Design an enzyme around this catalytic site. Sequence first.
Site, PDB file in Angstrom:
ATOM      1  N   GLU A 205       0.802  -1.215   0.000  1.00  8.99           N
ATOM      2  CA  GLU A 205       0.000   0.000   0.000  1.00  8.99           C
ATOM      3  C   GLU A 205       0.838   1.270   0.000  1.00  8.99           C
ATOM      4  OE1 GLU A 205      -2.970  -0.264   3.100  1.00  8.99           O
ATOM      5  OE2 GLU A 205      -4.212  -1.510   1.774  1.00  8.99           O
ATOM      6  N   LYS A 335     -15.818  -1.631   1.235  1.00 12.51           N
ATOM      7  CA  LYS A 335     -15.078  -2.251   0.142  1.00 12.51           C
ATOM      8  C   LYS A 335     -16.096  -2.797  -0.850  1.00 12.51           C
ATOM      9  CE  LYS A 335     -11.030  -3.725   2.850  1.00 12.51           C
ATOM     10  NZ  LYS A 335     -10.421  -4.887   3.565  1.00 12.51           N
TER      11      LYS A 335
HETATM   12  O1  LIG Z   1      -7.451  -4.582   5.698  1.00 13.45           O
HETATM   13  C1  LIG Z   1      -7.770  -3.627   4.936  1.00 13.45           C
HETATM   14  O2  LIG Z   1      -8.342  -2.610   5.393  1.00 13.45           O
HETATM   15  C2  LIG Z   1      -7.466  -3.720   3.444  1.00 13.45           C
HETATM   16  C3  LIG Z   1      -5.975  -3.489   3.285  1.00 13.45           C
HETATM   17  O3  LIG Z   1      -5.708  -2.167   3.687  1.00 13.45           O
HETATM   18  O4  LIG Z   1      -7.950  -4.982   3.062  1.00 13.45           O
HETATM   19  P1  LIG Z   1      -7.293  -6.076   2.021  1.00 13.45           P
HETATM   20  O5  LIG Z   1      -5.834  -6.330   2.297  1.00 13.45           O
HETATM   21  O6  LIG Z   1      -8.041  -7.367   2.249  1.00 13.45           O
HETATM   22  O7  LIG Z   1      -7.525  -5.630   0.603  1.00 13.45           O
HETATM   23 MG   LIG Z   2      -8.744  -3.851   7.506  1.00 14.74          MG
END
Ligand SMILES: O=C(O)[C@@H](CO)OP(=O)(O)O
Ligand SMILES: [Mg+2]
Lengths: 426, 437
Positions: A205, A335
């Site tokens: 990220e 999401k």
């Molecule tokens: O945990 C979260 O908030 C996001 C990553 O920032 O989810 P994932 O890794 O599953 O995409």
């Molecule tokens: Mg999370």
Amino acid sequence: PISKIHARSVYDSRGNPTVEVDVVTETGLHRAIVPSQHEAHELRDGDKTQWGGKGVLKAVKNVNETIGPALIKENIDVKDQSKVDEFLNKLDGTANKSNLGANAILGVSLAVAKAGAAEKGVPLYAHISDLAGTKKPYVLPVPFQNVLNGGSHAGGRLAFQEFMIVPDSAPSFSEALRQGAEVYQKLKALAKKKYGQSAGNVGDEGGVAPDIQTAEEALDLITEAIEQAGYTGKIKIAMDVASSEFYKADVKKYDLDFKNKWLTYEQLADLYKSLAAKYPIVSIEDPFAEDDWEAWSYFYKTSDFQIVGDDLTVTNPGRIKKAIELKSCNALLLKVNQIGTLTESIQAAKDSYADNWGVMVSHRSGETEDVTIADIAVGLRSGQIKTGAPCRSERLAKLNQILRIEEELGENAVYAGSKFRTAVNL
Amino acid sequence: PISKIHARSVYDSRGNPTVEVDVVTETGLHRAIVPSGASTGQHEAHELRDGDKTQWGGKGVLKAVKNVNETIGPALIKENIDVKDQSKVDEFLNKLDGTANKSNLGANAILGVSLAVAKAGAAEKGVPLYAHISDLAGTKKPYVLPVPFQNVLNGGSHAGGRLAFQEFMIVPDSAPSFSEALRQGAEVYQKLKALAKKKYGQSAGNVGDEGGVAPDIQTAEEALDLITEAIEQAGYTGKIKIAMDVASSEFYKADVKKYDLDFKNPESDPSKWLTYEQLADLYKSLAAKYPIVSIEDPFAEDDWEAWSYFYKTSDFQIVGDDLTVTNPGRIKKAIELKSCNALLLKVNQIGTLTESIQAAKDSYADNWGVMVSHRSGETEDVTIADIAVGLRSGQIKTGAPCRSERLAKLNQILRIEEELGENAVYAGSKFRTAVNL
Ligand SMILES: O=C(O)[C@@H](CO)OP(=O)(O)O
Ligand SMILES: [Mg+2]
Ligand SMILES: O=C(O)[C@@H](CO)OP(=O)(O)O
Ligand SMILES: [Mg+2]
């Protein structure tokens, strides 16, 4: 009428295939890319000779051969997102979207939404505002920027997953971005100075992930970086603990050294309370495991800060209703590919707003150059977006898109600022 | 008739400001974002930064953006140049700046207008940008899709560690298609990332500026063994070659005429510093041991003697980057002195599309290869994908298959590949000569 619906495989920010969908109408081509326990079921090929089993040829095939032709013959007006998504779910027929693939369904859903916005002659965020019934002026989101990583992404004892800065005191989104960008540059330098040159390399990220042992150690580094940038007191801190990663469900204890002492949820709550009284922590995501409802409710009762469900709620109205009823959290991490359509995502936000929840529109760890969630955050009037460190363009493209929206809207948009928890009614 | 030209500040993949420019015509909005280098050569066109140390650490582009909005934009609209006449546009943009290195208005101000107008010109023609660039460059059909040179292991100024050489690339040239080349590289990359974590710890899986893993390793031999093992685990030994971008100007000690392969560590060990002959011996040993088909910036940006000495003995591709800075005047010198046989084409090293095309055409004229290149500070912009196809270069360098400022370019070529079908061929093993393929 829709003249063409076509999907293809493209690569996400981790180097894995994902689904991109084109929807062609009289206004042109409209394109969307899908990002990557109770989540909607993404369809992967499972061919271990191809992308390590992570191909999406079957999901792309389902768009081209099944969903596409059906939707065209069904002849739904592309502005009527609810009708489109109802038809998509009808086509699939399963609760978890495992027949056609949640990634196949969402790709069509998001591309049609852009076609609908274009038919209305408005940008996507205005269309989403219409769909969600959010008022004017528009609210630009506070960026929750994951500048330092621990847990499954780091090699130290640090169990918590994400440490974020929150530039909520800035007068504008543009100034908040500059502040966060400056703090990030200070932190990267600090990480290299205090932990070695290799500590400046970034995780998925865009944040750094040095070998840090304790949460206080990570927060002090962020604190130091905020000070070097001259923004102490103007920038807050948030965390994504991702505590499901170190929950030992058989003993009901949490292992803060799960990569090498174990805490009950009451002891872990004490730790959060101690961190929240020492550091300007305004939001904690997944402080307890995805089905540890008793712990969340215990924590909610005493906490004046934001408590964000991620794995707990998985953008799922059924899990949100349970969390509302049991008073388990006060904000939703949204999401879109956890539920798999835009309409169901908007409903999840609406259901959260009905309980005065905050809503933080979120990226996935596997992102793309697609910027739809920037328009989703503005359209939902959420006032909060989680889309990475100010590093790696699958993260910054979302921020850049909000900069364009900010400039485009001028006075018809205000920055959420310190009111991000209630920005929908700001 | 251009109706609007507007620039704004946006963020590149390292988190630094850069210039984005909108050009609005009858066909709608056309947008381009300017990249930004880290290991920038001394002779590159001048990137205009604000230098206000209280804002973005001095890296603001407000002044460059202002130059587009206040000076370039209104002057280009009033000049009323047809947007598909790219040469006339870039002729006008350079006249407006009036300096050689574009230090007046800023090369980043000029390039953003140049590329956005190029997309406007393509749209007035009703063709994709790559087809419009093919018209501008005079390149023949069918279209040639480029071999992706994928920097899967980062060193140098792009990552933190002890590795002097900047870039270690895999080269999927045996693949029957661009799509298959991408899958092969993605599979190798995943094997490499897991292998780096196993041999050097979980932190070795974090990535440098261009998406490659950055394990804490010392020598090029170690980096090449790791890539070799990854290629074999993915099952592609013999089908994927290796390329390097040494970026040797970063560790050239110009006064002593020596090269420091440990320039990241204050441990000098000046007896371990190498002359260009000893450095050339190292390249020859690596090229005879590993399937190294291309070496970029093996010697410093003005160490012409070293380049010519190396060129004489070398049958592989020798790529000028800092040596040539996409600059026709420096390319002419490299042709005359026989210093290299390929151009790394960075549009923002020279600052207009037309000069970049001229740089490519001048290279083709000496039978050079041309490798269209990203900068280490990239954006979501995908212009160089259409440039690589339009120039029929047959090679592109746009990152590891990781971080979307890299993959967006590869995804764009996937779309071009699907759009063209049989009207396009993969350069494959002929990437050095793809313009005439
Ligand atoms: O945990 C979260 O908030 C996001 C990553 O920032 O989810 P994932 O890794 O599953 O995409
Ligand atoms: Mg999370
Ligand atoms: O040296 C190079 O070839 C480029 C791209 O890899 O890096 P930079 O943009 O930092 O000059
Ligand atoms: Mg180079």
